[PDB]
Design a binder for this molecule. Structure first.
Ligand code: MG
Ligand code: MG
Length: 134
RNA sequence: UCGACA
DNA sequence: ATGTCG
């Protein structure tokens, strides 16, 4: 039913899938951009959606913030709950970068605790997530 | 069937 | 329109 305005919204942006991946986190209320990751030459949508949520967890934890995080990605929300990113992306020299980030994010989740609620953004009811690249 | 990314 | 990540 209602939107928690006091929250962080994250989203992935890509050119191709697999292709160039970036992601960002914004204040759900204002759209202020709080963080934006530099483009990764090759990655998948779901790897970027996963990295964006874990980045968000780290970002809120470091700031002593209890805000929830919104993502529109059912996949990535589950990966974070599992502490495991089940991506099909081949491992090679070109995908080394994003696979290192993904392994590091998983290791962060295995070494830290959080109470942050990770919430599904209801695109069908509320329109595009406010972190959308549009 | 559904959630995304193009 | 057609394609890929889940
Ligand atoms: Mg998304
Ligand atoms: Mg989007």
């Amino acid at each position: 039913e209602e939107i928690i305005w006091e929250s962080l919204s994250v989203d992935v942006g890509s050119q191709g899938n697999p292709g160039i991946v970036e992601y960002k986190g914004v204040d759900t209320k204002t759209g202020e951009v709080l963080f934006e990751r530099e483009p990764i030459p090759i990655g998948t949508n779901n790897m970027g959606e996963f990295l964006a949520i874990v980045h968000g967890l780290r970002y809120l934890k470091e700031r002593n913030s209890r805000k929830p995080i919104y993502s529109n990605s059912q996949t990535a929300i589950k990966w974070v709950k599992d502490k495991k990113a089940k991506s099909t992306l081949v491992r090679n020299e070109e995908t080394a970068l994003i696979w290192k980030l993904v392994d590091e994010a998983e290791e962060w989740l295995n070494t830290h605790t959080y109470e942050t609620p990770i919430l599904k953004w209801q695109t069908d009811k509320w329109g595009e997530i406010k972190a959308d690249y549009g």
